Design a protein around this nucleic acid. Structure first.
Ligand SMILES: [Mg+2]
Length: 211
RNA sequence: AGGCCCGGGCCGCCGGUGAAAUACCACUACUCUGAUCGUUUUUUCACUGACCCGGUGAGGCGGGGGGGCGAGCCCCGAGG
């Protein structure tokens, strides 16, 4: 506990701020051990955090008549089916969208449009839209949900994701790490056994080596 | 979203492009190399003395000597 998480916290406070002008976002860098990536089940997970957004902005864009109205209401982006279809030109416009929009939403438009009318590419970028809108929620809550941490294992024995903000500093911080490190252990094939090291990195340099 | 200038400096997340990169930072993974007699793990070959087998009334084995009917080679005084 305090032996392990408090010591490293203090390092970030003394270091970091003075080290680099401008503030980035902390990320939890993990290293697996004694695991076979392609010969064994891939563990994919998605969990919430307390009340802090890891991504700075660009929450999501939706596609539906009413959701687009509520979109112009509280959200900057309100794309619609007919506006969305750009065909072959979309390939590059959608690559730009993947570079921009951190996430995407769709009220039943995604079921048919992305495989067909929108096209592929969102999957290639790893960002397919979510059916989080179903005419049964308010998009403010959906935007609060889009500020989470998502896990999927790949060939590299390491998955790194937004775990904190240099600008936001509270005990809650590590409580997000505590939630995150446990969440991997929960969905890992055989628990803590296959974790070689854990790292929390913010901005530039190497500030943490948990376990 | 050039870290990095003397109170005025540049790589690129610019645009393209490829299936994904082109600042900056990390994180691994793998292939190679020296070191650590640090940890163990093993493979081949050879020996004989345990042990095994066969033969025999356990009858001539091993090394050396001596001699050719000797053979190649040497100063040959054509030769101990
Ligand atoms: Mg005999």
């Amino acid at each position: 506990r305090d032996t392990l998480y408090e010591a490293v916290r203090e390092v970030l406070h003394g270091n970091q701020r003075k080290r680099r002008k401008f503030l980035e976002t902390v990320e939890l860098q993990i290293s697996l051990k004694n695991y076979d990536p392609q010969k064994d089940k891939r563990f994919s997970g998605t969990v919430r955090l307390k009340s802090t957004p890891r991504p700075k902005f660009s929450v999501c864009v939706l596609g539906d008549q009413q959701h687009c109205d509520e979109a112009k209401a509280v959200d900057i982006p309100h794309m619609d089916i007919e506006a969305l279809k750009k065909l072959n030109k979309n390939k590059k416009l959608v690559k730009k969208l993947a570079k921009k929009y951190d996430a995407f939403l769709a009220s039943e438009s995604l079921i048919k449009q992305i495989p067909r009318i929108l096209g592929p590419g969102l999957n290639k970028a790893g960002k397919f839209p979510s059916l989080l809108t179903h005419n049964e929620n308010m998009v403010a809550k959906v935007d609060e949900v889009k500020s989470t941490i998502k896990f999927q294992m790949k060939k590299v024995l390491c998955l790194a994701v937004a775990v904190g903000h240099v600008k936001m500093t509270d005990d809650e911080l590590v409580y997000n790490i505590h939630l995150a490190v446990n969440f991997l252990v929960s969905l890992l094939k055989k628990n803590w056994q296959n974790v070689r090291a854990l790292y929390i990195k913010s901005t530039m340099g190497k500030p943490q080596r948990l376990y």
